[PDB]
Amino acid sequence: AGPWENMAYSMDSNSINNIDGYISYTGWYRPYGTSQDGKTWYPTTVADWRPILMYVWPSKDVQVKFIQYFVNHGYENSNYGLTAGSVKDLSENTASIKLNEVAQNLRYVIEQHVVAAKSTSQLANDINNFITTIPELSKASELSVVNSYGYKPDNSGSVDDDQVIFVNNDSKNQKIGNTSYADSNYRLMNRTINNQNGDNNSDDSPELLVGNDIDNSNPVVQAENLNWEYFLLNYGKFMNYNPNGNFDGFRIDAADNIDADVLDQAAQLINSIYNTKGNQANANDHLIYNEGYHLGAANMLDRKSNPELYMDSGYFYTLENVLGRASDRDDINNLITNSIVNRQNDVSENVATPNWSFVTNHDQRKNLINQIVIDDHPGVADIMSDGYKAEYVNQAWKEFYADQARTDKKYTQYNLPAQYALLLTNKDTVPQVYYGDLYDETDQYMQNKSVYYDAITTLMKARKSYVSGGQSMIKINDHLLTSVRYGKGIIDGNVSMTDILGRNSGIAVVVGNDAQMANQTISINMGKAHANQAYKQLLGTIDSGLTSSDTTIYHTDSNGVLNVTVKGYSNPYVSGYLGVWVPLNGGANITTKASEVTNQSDKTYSSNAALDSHVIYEDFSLFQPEPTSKAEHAYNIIADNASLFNELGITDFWMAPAYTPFNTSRYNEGYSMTDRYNLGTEANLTKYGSGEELSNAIAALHDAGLKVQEDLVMNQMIGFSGQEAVTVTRTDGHAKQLTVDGKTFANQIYFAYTRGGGEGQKNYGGKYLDELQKKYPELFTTKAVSTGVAPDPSVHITEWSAKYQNGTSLQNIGIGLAVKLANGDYAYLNDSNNKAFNTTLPETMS
Amino acid sequence: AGPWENMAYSMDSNSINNIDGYISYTGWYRPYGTSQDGKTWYPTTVADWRPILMYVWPSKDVQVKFIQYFVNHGYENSNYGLTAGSVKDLSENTASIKLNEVAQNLRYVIEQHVVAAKSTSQLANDINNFITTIPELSKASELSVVNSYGYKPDNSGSVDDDQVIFVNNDSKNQKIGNTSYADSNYRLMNRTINNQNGDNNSDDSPELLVGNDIDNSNPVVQAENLNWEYFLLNYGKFMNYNPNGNFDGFRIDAADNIDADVLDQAAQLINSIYNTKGNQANANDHLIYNEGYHLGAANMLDRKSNPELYMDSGYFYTLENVLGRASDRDDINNLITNSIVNRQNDVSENVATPNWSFVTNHDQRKNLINQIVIDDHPGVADIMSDGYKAEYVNQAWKEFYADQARTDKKYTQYNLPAQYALLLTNKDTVPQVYYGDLYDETDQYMQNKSVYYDAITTLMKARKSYVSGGQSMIKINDHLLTSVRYGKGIIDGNVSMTDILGRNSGIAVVVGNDAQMANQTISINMGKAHANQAYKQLLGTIDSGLTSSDTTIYHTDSNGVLNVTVKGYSNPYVSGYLGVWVPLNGGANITTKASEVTNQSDKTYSSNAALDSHVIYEDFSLFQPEPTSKAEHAYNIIADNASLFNELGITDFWMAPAYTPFNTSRYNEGYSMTDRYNLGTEANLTKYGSGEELSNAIAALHDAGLKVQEDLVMNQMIGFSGQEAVTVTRTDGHAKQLTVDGKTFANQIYFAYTRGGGEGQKNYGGKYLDELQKKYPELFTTKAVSTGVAPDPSVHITEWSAKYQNGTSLQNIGIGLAVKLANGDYAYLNDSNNKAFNTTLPETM
Ligand SMILES: [Ca+2]
Ligand SMILES: [Ca+2]
Ligand SMILES: [Ca+2]
Ligand SMILES: [Ca+2]
Ligand SMILES: [Ca+2]
Ligand SMILES: [Ca+2]
Ligand SMILES: [Ca+2]
Ligand SMILES: [Ca+2]
Ligand SMILES: [Ca+2]
Ligand SMILES: [Ca+2]
Ligand SMILES: [Ca+2]
């Protein structure tokens, strides 16, 4: 009958793509009919949908660009007045009447193309491409700082300041819109570390990192975290896999970036289940160690009587600045002082902050490799984002291994054996060894021992026999120190009486960071307990590198003093000097059990010989490849190697984030995850294997006497498949509004991917809360610090959604996708579920 | 008779150099006797002094290096066992008794040298040089971040993180020491901007910049600032110079970096003398505009009913980002939205934050020059500090002038005329013009006009005749806007009825930033008050540059619409487009006097046509040369040119900081000052001239109808000559303790230069406080925000000292100079002035 058939077949979701009642220019809809000429109109079936952009545009300008793009991409018909020449002079200043005329004729030429191919598929590509040319309909309008003037890439590989926060919006003003289903009374952001009570922001630790940031201030979320944690502490049991395949504790990821209440609550759950507060015997069996690069966390943990191990990142920087650099190395004395533990004369217990320390972790390998890529692509701003490429990393790796075998290294660490020698002999710490320093981490899992394997395992194994007792570190000259442990039960170097175990243990580590250091003879006080004793050299420096096979027998005088002679070397392994001496009669195990030290009734963790006896092993690398068979699954190899890890004195196996990875994430490593409860199936493996294989790995490790921790990731999820209309504001990592190249936006409706969770969340979300409330009522009557209320188990989270999220890093969708009428009213589809406004549609559809 | 004569001739200041009782390894003392051979000793005269470093050292290792350094610099005698081979094997592990034996023989050899020549002059240089090799006795021990791993230089030219703060130290522990004369109960640092009350650090604005930071939280200092301000407000009268040579108000330097009590009290003073609060007629005659690069100051000043003008630094960034960049210019639209004032349809009065705005100031020119220097010397960390050289700056200037003349500019601003076109036509601001944009600022003052003189002054003069009424800005395309003023007394574009002054004023500025923009015709709404009216093009673009002599007569239709045709151009002056139209029958002055607009009884400054009638002129460049004659003094030239400034419509003459410069400061410009009250004498000229010459410049400017502001500089002084023993901690510019390459220090005695002030401070410090206290008692009963205490005029500051200071930027002296005994007790000289400890000297002394 007429062109009114452009109107939607119905004014509801059955005919009009929408998201919570809002329309998107990228949406499609089913009109009543279509037409290849103005004269004949065919009604649409239920399978005939058309892009909204054929009918509506955000401005007359975009409408002109729509015409101009399609005409120049094959949709011209001089009979209808459409050709490159006929449309080149159209602009926003053309009368509205004419432009619509032209637009109405273009649809005809489109339907012509649709009919010839019997398909909208080519048209779909042309719409998608064209959208890419319009900033407000594509990602550019999100104002990534990557495109800002003078932006430099960050070798972390992510973009701290590309964020939007989810804000409440219950407006009755249709120009502002209404997303009340996504409203929240919580979203208390930056309640991080000492700002848990919002009254001390001295750590300045940001809430937003990457992905969908989880609102860990919401009591229903806080309840779900406990459900999740409880699931993982019983993983094998609750999954009917190996009944001994359960995690014992947690590596807490991004503990500087979540509401700190959830640290209290994870440590409360483990105390409720296992009785850890005031009982180091039990607490040492359920380690919780927090990832952090903020020194203030050590204040907080000491304040809370140490519910979690603090990460001694200051010492990592010390290690790299003093020993790792090529030149301009820092004062050798800083190794004595620049850590959470001053180790000049560490001759006490229960005084240091319980802490874990490292030479490398998976993030520090990431930063260095990314740096290599950045160096090979100067002036390319998107090299770590939209212009990131795997092949660049492959090339940086070939550079990394080649640089690693050099003496004058360009990118890799100098003095890595000395670094580990100090780590594995320091008192008052739980040291952590990195998988990628033992194995070449891009090859299949544990298939290539690195150049540093022999030296580190030599030190790891020696720690079991020699590292106990007091500690003393002495600066010998400007580039040379000794660090001495006195042996089991020996408090200090003036102790004369000891038992057999102490007598035959203790250790001297000698470290220099001047490759030109003059030959010279030094005196090492080993302690009165070690007078007239035979020592051998566990590990020494030779021109080509390192030896563990010096057959000399060294002797202490009647004062426990050992004289050795040391000089500077320069080789792939040592830039300076490295030398380690242990008692000749030694070898017996000297680890301390919790029942041999005095329990501290007012601490969870307490820094002493028992806790010191522990060794954490980071079991993965982000650059670990995908396996090509069942036998290359990390879980399976880990099961078969449980005894090797125990031989090395590892007691605490930090296992990779096991969760189902978003399949387009950069490393497939598990932090970018779609499902917190699905740790792999036969049909859908993770990089590491299947959940059943995980439960066997954990069981094998327990059988070798080790405890296992899971990377608990409360900060964010990535890869949700469902969109919600959310009101957002462009912010920085700290959730403060951000202006980019003079532009910003606030309180705008955004079609973010926010709803999902997988079958894992559907079937296990909230499943144990009733059981937890029965067994542990305290978890749901203890008021959280930041909120003043207890975790709320009366709601189960079976599917995530924006009401449970603080915001998201930019998703590359664009900010002007929501359709707005000429007067600025949002278009809207009213029905039973969506009652924010009356139905309000563009004229062409209405 | 023997080595006991090494002891000091007396255990007091008469024979031992010291600072407040503390001894320095760099000091000298008079021993009782000296000897060349260990056998004969000659007693010393009053003139026979020896360096302490010949007798005492901070460690055995430095004693070793002292021996080794002097033997290898010509103090060798094999008869005395001193030769290069005889000393190379010494080390801190040599027995102390032997090293002291060796050191005693070295003195004999030193004394041999001292007798051969008849002088300790060569020994002085050897000592001085030697100290340069010991980190703990020289500047490296200060932990300058310039030397840190990975340091990059800052084109500001200073080092924000090289600071120490002065802390209280009244200890009876001789290992901690005692500097209680330097104690204070104030030193409330970072009470800056919105953190005046200590409860809102959201601006995060640091206390420490450079030099000796003045503790503007101290009530005695606050009272002295009032004394100073009152002196400057009466400069010519109180100096018996020209009786009309007095400043009228202030540009306030580093307003973001001083306790904000001090902004209140300068506004209070102006109000007490001149009755400015609630009276814009008086207030506009006594402008106080605040230097600021922090947006948070706009809120503070709005909260305080605008006692000072806010500095619209946001808009300056917008100007450089949208128009001045070579490429990737920001959205033209930002010129409408990105300033303290949104100018889409600015059709109101008394709403906007009273503000001053600029295209350039002397600090932005400096950052750019330094950046040229840094580009010219990549990878050199000290290039802006110890490695700074004027010759590099000379080279940068040859580059600046050459690049300025290019079309493809590498360093200088694109579209500078259009920037000033927008600045000088914007409503709701007091615009500020930069001296260095009208003149080639490295030449003698005003001797050389720049390439931009004709254009800026054309717009400047035009403002007198055309710029008034409401404002509308309209984005025409992605790279092109019009900004329009409707003329005197015309509120908006819909007003139809107006007097003759309105009919013949108003102005259209058309600004494009796309040099390849297509030729196109545009419509400009001039307002219903401007229908059927002839227009002339005041300033336009031509292929080679700018015209202001287009003879074309343009006409508006019956709605006030002006149709012009514009395109993109590319030449040294325009990258994009610039075009300016005004009514043909215009020319009459249209500035507004305070009495024509409604006074705001609850504001000091209010943003309306009278405030908008003012124009600030920054009179100086840091790179101004030294004059070579009397005729070349900036003051003398300013007096001869007062009519020029008023012809340009300048009403507010921002005068350079007139204080006596520290004679080795970088620009000699007056911010690095030794004397706050001495603005130049005939025998000791500042760069700009003599105080008497300044008074005649001010009077000439007044004679031309201008008001004159002095750059008021309360943040810091530099160049004190008196040292004090002060207890310091290494900090960043926010007074937070800092670690550098893993090192820090805290509560350490430092021999800082902190005492001075000049005769100006002696003869005028506190001089008017009795007068002020009787005239304006409120100044000394109003309690300051930060301290809850009124300024205290019962102590006069006639000499500055560390008790009146927050701290200092690193003075490049060293931190381990104070002499420490083996047990860590500080050495000390007890006399009638210094009673912190018993006298306690090294054993040799
Ligand atoms: Ca977070
Ligand atoms: Ca992390
Ligand atoms: Ca229990
Ligand atoms: Ca994949
Ligand atoms: Ca991104
Ligand atoms: Ca360095
Ligand atoms: Ca600064
Ligand atoms: Ca200050
Ligand atoms: Ca300044
Ligand atoms: Ca010149
Ligand atoms: Ca010139």
mmCIF file with all atom_site columns, N, CA, C and O in Angstrom, chain A residues 92 149 201 325 327-328 330-331 334 338 476-477 739 741-743, chain B residues 92 149 201 325 327-328 330-331 333-334 337-338 476 739 741-743:
data_model
loop_
_atom_site.group_PDB
_atom_site.id
_atom_site.type_symbol
_atom_site.label_atom_id
_atom_site.label_alt_id
_atom_site.label_comp_id
_atom_site.label_asym_id
_atom_site.label_entity_id
_atom_site.label_seq_id
_atom_site.pdbx_PDB_ins_code
_atom_site.Cartn_x
_atom_site.Cartn_y
_atom_site.Cartn_z
_atom_site.occupancy
_atom_site.B_iso_or_equiv
_atom_site.pdbx_formal_charge
_atom_site.auth_seq_id
_atom_site.auth_comp_id
_atom_site.auth_asym_id
_atom_site.auth_atom_id
_atom_site.pdbx_PDB_model_num
ATOM 1   N N  . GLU A 1 92  ? 25.410 17.834 5.607  1.00 0.00 ? 92  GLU A N  1
ATOM 2   C CA . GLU A 1 92  ? 24.421 18.094 6.650  1.00 0.00 ? 92  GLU A CA 1
ATOM 3   C C  . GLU A 1 92  ? 23.558 19.311 6.343  1.00 0.00 ? 92  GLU A C  1
ATOM 4   O O  . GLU A 1 92  ? 22.491 19.475 6.948  1.00 0.00 ? 92  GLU A O  1
ATOM 5   N N  . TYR A 1 149 ? 47.234 12.563 22.547 1.00 0.00 ? 149 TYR A N  1
ATOM 6   C CA . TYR A 1 149 ? 48.464 13.191 22.096 1.00 0.00 ? 149 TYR A CA 1
ATOM 7   C C  . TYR A 1 149 ? 49.618 12.826 23.027 1.00 0.00 ? 149 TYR A C  1
ATOM 8   O O  . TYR A 1 149 ? 49.521 12.972 24.248 1.00 0.00 ? 149 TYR A O  1
ATOM 9   N N  . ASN A 1 201 ? 43.839 7.424  52.380 1.00 0.00 ? 201 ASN A N  1
ATOM 10  C CA . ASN A 1 201 ? 44.149 7.057  51.003 1.00 0.00 ? 201 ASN A CA 1
ATOM 11  C C  . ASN A 1 201 ? 45.628 7.185  50.691 1.00 0.00 ? 201 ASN A C  1
ATOM 12  O O  . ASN A 1 201 ? 46.004 7.391  49.528 1.00 0.00 ? 201 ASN A O  1
ATOM 13  N N  . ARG A 1 325 ? 71.367 -5.024 37.319 1.00 0.00 ? 325 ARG A N  1
ATOM 14  C CA . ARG A 1 325 ? 71.665 -4.018 36.298 1.00 0.00 ? 325 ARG A CA 1
ATOM 15  C C  . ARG A 1 325 ? 72.983 -4.300 35.567 1.00 0.00 ? 325 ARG A C  1
ATOM 16  O O  . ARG A 1 325 ? 73.885 -4.973 36.072 1.00 0.00 ? 325 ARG A O  1
ATOM 17  N N  . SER A 1 327 ? 74.986 -1.683 34.632 1.00 0.00 ? 327 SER A N  1
ATOM 18  C CA . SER A 1 327 ? 75.903 -0.674 35.133 1.00 0.00 ? 327 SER A CA 1
ATOM 19  C C  . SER A 1 327 ? 75.139 0.231  36.085 1.00 0.00 ? 327 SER A C  1
ATOM 20  O O  . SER A 1 327 ? 73.913 0.155  36.192 1.00 0.00 ? 327 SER A O  1
ATOM 21  N N  . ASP A 1 328 ? 75.881 1.096  36.777 1.00 0.00 ? 328 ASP A N  1
ATOM 22  C CA . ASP A 1 328 ? 75.304 2.001  37.767 1.00 0.00 ? 328 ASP A CA 1
ATOM 23  C C  . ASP A 1 328 ? 74.484 1.222  38.794 1.00 0.00 ? 328 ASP A C  1
ATOM 24  O O  . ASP A 1 328 ? 73.393 1.633  39.186 1.00 0.00 ? 328 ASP A O  1
ATOM 25  N N  . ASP A 1 330 ? 73.309 -0.201 42.350 1.00 0.00 ? 330 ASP A N  1
ATOM 26  C CA . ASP A 1 330 ? 73.118 0.516  43.590 1.00 0.00 ? 330 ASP A CA 1
ATOM 27  C C  . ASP A 1 330 ? 74.021 -0.052 44.676 1.00 0.00 ? 330 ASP A C  1
ATOM 28  O O  . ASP A 1 330 ? 74.695 -1.073 44.491 1.00 0.00 ? 330 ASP A O  1
ATOM 29  N N  . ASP A 1 331 ? 74.011 0.619  45.836 1.00 0.00 ? 331 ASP A N  1
ATOM 30  C CA . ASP A 1 331 ? 74.894 0.248  46.927 1.00 0.00 ? 331 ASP A CA 1
ATOM 31  C C  . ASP A 1 331 ? 74.623 -1.188 47.368 1.00 0.00 ? 331 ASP A C  1
ATOM 32  O O  . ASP A 1 331 ? 73.485 -1.560 47.671 1.00 0.00 ? 331 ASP A O  1
ATOM 33  N N  . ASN A 1 334 ? 72.369 -1.964 50.259 1.00 0.00 ? 334 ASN A N  1
ATOM 34  C CA . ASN A 1 334 ? 70.917 -1.948 50.187 1.00 0.00 ? 334 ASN A CA 1
ATOM 35  C C  . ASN A 1 334 ? 70.345 -3.355 50.304 1.00 0.00 ? 334 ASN A C  1
ATOM 36  O O  . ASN A 1 334 ? 69.226 -3.530 50.807 1.00 0.00 ? 334 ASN A O  1
ATOM 37  N N  . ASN A 1 338 ? 67.274 -2.762 52.361 1.00 0.00 ? 338 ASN A N  1
ATOM 38  C CA . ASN A 1 338 ? 66.092 -2.398 51.576 1.00 0.00 ? 338 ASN A CA 1
ATOM 39  C C  . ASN A 1 338 ? 65.267 -3.655 51.310 1.00 0.00 ? 338 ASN A C  1
ATOM 40  O O  . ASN A 1 338 ? 65.317 -4.278 50.242 1.00 0.00 ? 338 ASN A O  1
ATOM 41  N N  . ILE A 1 476 ? 81.576 -5.773 53.207 1.00 0.00 ? 476 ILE A N  1
ATOM 42  C CA . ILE A 1 476 ? 83.019 -5.999 53.325 1.00 0.00 ? 476 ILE A CA 1
ATOM 43  C C  . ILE A 1 476 ? 83.813 -4.880 52.670 1.00 0.00 ? 476 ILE A C  1
ATOM 44  O O  . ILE A 1 476 ? 84.803 -4.397 53.230 1.00 0.00 ? 476 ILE A O  1
ATOM 45  N N  . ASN A 1 477 ? 83.422 -4.488 51.464 1.00 0.00 ? 477 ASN A N  1
ATOM 46  C CA . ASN A 1 477 ? 83.895 -3.244 50.868 1.00 0.00 ? 477 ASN A CA 1
ATOM 47  C C  . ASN A 1 477 ? 82.749 -2.671 50.044 1.00 0.00 ? 477 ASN A C  1
ATOM 48  O O  . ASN A 1 477 ? 81.592 -3.074 50.205 1.00 0.00 ? 477 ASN A O  1
ATOM 49  N N  . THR A 1 739 ? 39.479 13.312 31.444 1.00 0.00 ? 739 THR A N  1
ATOM 50  C CA . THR A 1 739 ? 39.423 14.053 30.199 1.00 0.00 ? 739 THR A CA 1
ATOM 51  C C  . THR A 1 739 ? 40.568 13.552 29.332 1.00 0.00 ? 739 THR A C  1
ATOM 52  O O  . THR A 1 739 ? 41.681 13.373 29.831 1.00 0.00 ? 739 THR A O  1
ATOM 53  N N  . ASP A 1 741 ? 42.354 14.221 25.500 1.00 0.00 ? 741 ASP A N  1
ATOM 54  C CA . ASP A 1 741 ? 42.444 15.176 24.396 1.00 0.00 ? 741 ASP A CA 1
ATOM 55  C C  . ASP A 1 741 ? 41.288 16.183 24.459 1.00 0.00 ? 741 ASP A C  1
ATOM 56  O O  . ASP A 1 741 ? 40.593 16.447 23.471 1.00 0.00 ? 741 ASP A O  1
ATOM 57  N N  . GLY A 1 742 ? 41.043 16.695 25.666 1.00 0.00 ? 742 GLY A N  1
ATOM 58  C CA . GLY A 1 742 ? 40.009 17.684 25.879 1.00 0.00 ? 742 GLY A CA 1
ATOM 59  C C  . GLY A 1 742 ? 38.592 17.163 25.864 1.00 0.00 ? 742 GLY A C  1
ATOM 60  O O  . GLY A 1 742 ? 37.653 17.967 25.902 1.00 0.00 ? 742 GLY A O  1
ATOM 61  N N  . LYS A 1 743 ? 38.398 15.856 25.793 1.00 0.00 ? 743 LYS A N  1
ATOM 62  C CA . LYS A 1 743 ? 37.066 15.293 25.703 1.00 0.00 ? 743 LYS A CA 1
ATOM 63  C C  . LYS A 1 743 ? 36.823 14.362 26.880 1.00 0.00 ? 743 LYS A C  1
ATOM 64  O O  . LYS A 1 743 ? 37.758 13.824 27.472 1.00 0.00 ? 743 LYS A O  1
ATOM 65  N N  . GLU B 2 92  ? 91.546 1.095  55.155 1.00 0.00 ? 92  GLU B N  1
ATOM 66  C CA . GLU B 2 92  ? 90.886 1.179  56.452 1.00 0.00 ? 92  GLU B CA 1
ATOM 67  C C  . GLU B 2 92  ? 91.280 0.044  57.380 1.00 0.00 ? 92  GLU B C  1
ATOM 68  O O  . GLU B 2 92  ? 91.028 0.125  58.588 1.00 0.00 ? 92  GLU B O  1
ATOM 69  N N  . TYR B 2 149 ? 69.208 6.609  39.092 1.00 0.00 ? 149 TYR B N  1
ATOM 70  C CA . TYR B 2 149 ? 69.219 5.716  37.942 1.00 0.00 ? 149 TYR B CA 1
ATOM 71  C C  . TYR B 2 149 ? 68.012 6.001  37.056 1.00 0.00 ? 149 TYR B C  1
ATOM 72  O O  . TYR B 2 149 ? 66.866 5.948  37.521 1.00 0.00 ? 149 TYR B O  1
ATOM 73  N N  . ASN B 2 201 ? 43.250 17.496 50.635 1.00 0.00 ? 201 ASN B N  1
ATOM 74  C CA . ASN B 2 201 ? 44.457 17.518 49.824 1.00 0.00 ? 201 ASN B CA 1
ATOM 75  C C  . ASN B 2 201 ? 44.189 17.159 48.364 1.00 0.00 ? 201 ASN B C  1
ATOM 76  O O  . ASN B 2 201 ? 45.076 16.630 47.686 1.00 0.00 ? 201 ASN B O  1
ATOM 77  N N  . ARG B 2 325 ? 49.778 23.256 17.990 1.00 0.00 ? 325 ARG B N  1
ATOM 78  C CA . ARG B 2 325 ? 50.487 22.029 17.640 1.00 0.00 ? 325 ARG B CA 1
ATOM 79  C C  . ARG B 2 325 ? 50.728 21.937 16.135 1.00 0.00 ? 325 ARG B C  1
ATOM 80  O O  . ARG B 2 325 ? 49.912 22.387 15.322 1.00 0.00 ? 325 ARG B O  1
ATOM 81  N N  . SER B 2 327 ? 50.603 19.123 14.449 1.00 0.00 ? 327 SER B N  1
ATOM 82  C CA . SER B 2 327 ? 49.644 18.158 13.915 1.00 0.00 ? 327 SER B CA 1
ATOM 83  C C  . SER B 2 327 ? 48.878 17.528 15.060 1.00 0.00 ? 327 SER B C  1
ATOM 84  O O  . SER B 2 327 ? 49.172 17.758 16.233 1.00 0.00 ? 327 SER B O  1
ATOM 85  N N  . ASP B 2 328 ? 47.894 16.714 14.706 1.00 0.00 ? 328 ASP B N  1
ATOM 86  C CA . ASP B 2 328 ? 47.042 16.067 15.701 1.00 0.00 ? 328 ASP B CA 1
ATOM 87  C C  . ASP B 2 328 ? 46.484 17.094 16.679 1.00 0.00 ? 328 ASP B C  1
ATOM 88  O O  . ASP B 2 328 ? 46.460 16.877 17.894 1.00 0.00 ? 328 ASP B O  1
ATOM 89  N N  . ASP B 2 330 ? 43.772 19.159 18.702 1.00 0.00 ? 330 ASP B N  1
ATOM 90  C CA . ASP B 2 330 ? 42.543 18.739 19.348 1.00 0.00 ? 330 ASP B CA 1
ATOM 91  C C  . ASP B 2 330 ? 41.345 19.426 18.696 1.00 0.00 ? 330 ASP B C  1
ATOM 92  O O  . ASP B 2 330 ? 41.480 20.319 17.862 1.00 0.00 ? 330 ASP B O  1
ATOM 93  N N  . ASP B 2 331 ? 40.154 18.986 19.097 1.00 0.00 ? 331 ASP B N  1
ATOM 94  C CA . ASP B 2 331 ? 38.920 19.447 18.481 1.00 0.00 ? 331 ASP B CA 1
ATOM 95  C C  . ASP B 2 331 ? 38.745 20.961 18.640 1.00 0.00 ? 331 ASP B C  1
ATOM 96  O O  . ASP B 2 331 ? 38.767 21.494 19.753 1.00 0.00 ? 331 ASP B O  1
ATOM 97  N N  . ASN B 2 333 ? 36.267 22.545 18.776 1.00 0.00 ? 333 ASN B N  1
ATOM 98  C CA . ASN B 2 333 ? 35.190 22.832 19.707 1.00 0.00 ? 333 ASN B CA 1
ATOM 99  C C  . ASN B 2 333 ? 35.724 23.105 21.107 1.00 0.00 ? 333 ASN B C  1
ATOM 100 O O  . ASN B 2 333 ? 35.102 23.845 21.877 1.00 0.00 ? 333 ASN B O  1
ATOM 101 N N  . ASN B 2 334 ? 36.895 22.554 21.437 1.00 0.00 ? 334 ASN B N  1
ATOM 102 C CA . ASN B 2 334 ? 37.415 22.686 22.789 1.00 0.00 ? 334 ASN B CA 1
ATOM 103 C C  . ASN B 2 334 ? 37.634 24.145 23.177 1.00 0.00 ? 334 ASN B C  1
ATOM 104 O O  . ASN B 2 334 ? 37.530 24.486 24.362 1.00 0.00 ? 334 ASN B O  1
ATOM 105 N N  . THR B 2 337 ? 34.537 25.133 25.078 1.00 0.00 ? 337 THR B N  1
ATOM 106 C CA . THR B 2 337 ? 34.192 24.450 26.322 1.00 0.00 ? 337 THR B CA 1
ATOM 107 C C  . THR B 2 337 ? 35.328 24.359 27.318 1.00 0.00 ? 337 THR B C  1
ATOM 108 O O  . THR B 2 337 ? 35.063 24.269 28.520 1.00 0.00 ? 337 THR B O  1
ATOM 109 N N  . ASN B 2 338 ? 36.579 24.364 26.853 1.00 0.00 ? 338 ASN B N  1
ATOM 110 C CA . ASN B 2 338 ? 37.719 23.995 27.695 1.00 0.00 ? 338 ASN B CA 1
ATOM 111 C C  . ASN B 2 338 ? 38.453 25.242 28.201 1.00 0.00 ? 338 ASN B C  1
ATOM 112 O O  . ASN B 2 338 ? 39.555 25.599 27.779 1.00 0.00 ? 338 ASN B O  1
ATOM 113 N N  . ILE B 2 476 ? 31.433 25.507 13.259 1.00 0.00 ? 476 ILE B N  1
ATOM 114 C CA . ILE B 2 476 ? 30.882 25.513 11.904 1.00 0.00 ? 476 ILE B CA 1
ATOM 115 C C  . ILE B 2 476 ? 31.141 24.189 11.193 1.00 0.00 ? 476 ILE B C  1
ATOM 116 O O  . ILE B 2 476 ? 30.250 23.629 10.545 1.00 0.00 ? 476 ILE B O  1
ATOM 117 N N  . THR B 2 739 ? 63.571 8.415  49.159 1.00 0.00 ? 739 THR B N  1
ATOM 118 C CA . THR B 2 739 ? 64.684 7.503  48.962 1.00 0.00 ? 739 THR B CA 1
ATOM 119 C C  . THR B 2 739 ? 65.199 7.652  47.540 1.00 0.00 ? 739 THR B C  1
ATOM 120 O O  . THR B 2 739 ? 64.402 7.726  46.604 1.00 0.00 ? 739 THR B O  1
ATOM 121 N N  . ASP B 2 741 ? 68.034 6.015  44.803 1.00 0.00 ? 741 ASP B N  1
ATOM 122 C CA . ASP B 2 741 ? 68.916 4.872  44.551 1.00 0.00 ? 741 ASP B CA 1
ATOM 123 C C  . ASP B 2 741 ? 69.083 4.040  45.823 1.00 0.00 ? 741 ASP B C  1
ATOM 124 O O  . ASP B 2 741 ? 70.172 3.555  46.146 1.00 0.00 ? 741 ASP B O  1
ATOM 125 N N  . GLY B 2 742 ? 67.988 3.907  46.576 1.00 0.00 ? 742 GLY B N  1
ATOM 126 C CA . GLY B 2 742 ? 67.977 3.142  47.801 1.00 0.00 ? 742 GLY B CA 1
ATOM 127 C C  . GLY B 2 742 ? 68.491 3.867  49.023 1.00 0.00 ? 742 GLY B C  1
ATOM 128 O O  . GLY B 2 742 ? 68.560 3.249  50.096 1.00 0.00 ? 742 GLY B O  1
ATOM 129 N N  . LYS B 2 743 ? 68.847 5.152  48.908 1.00 0.00 ? 743 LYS B N  1
ATOM 130 C CA . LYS B 2 743 ? 69.402 5.908  50.016 1.00 0.00 ? 743 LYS B CA 1
ATOM 131 C C  . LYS B 2 743 ? 68.457 7.015  50.478 1.00 0.00 ? 743 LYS B C  1
ATOM 132 O O  . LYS B 2 743 ? 67.694 7.580  49.691 1.00 0.00 ? 743 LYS B O  1
#
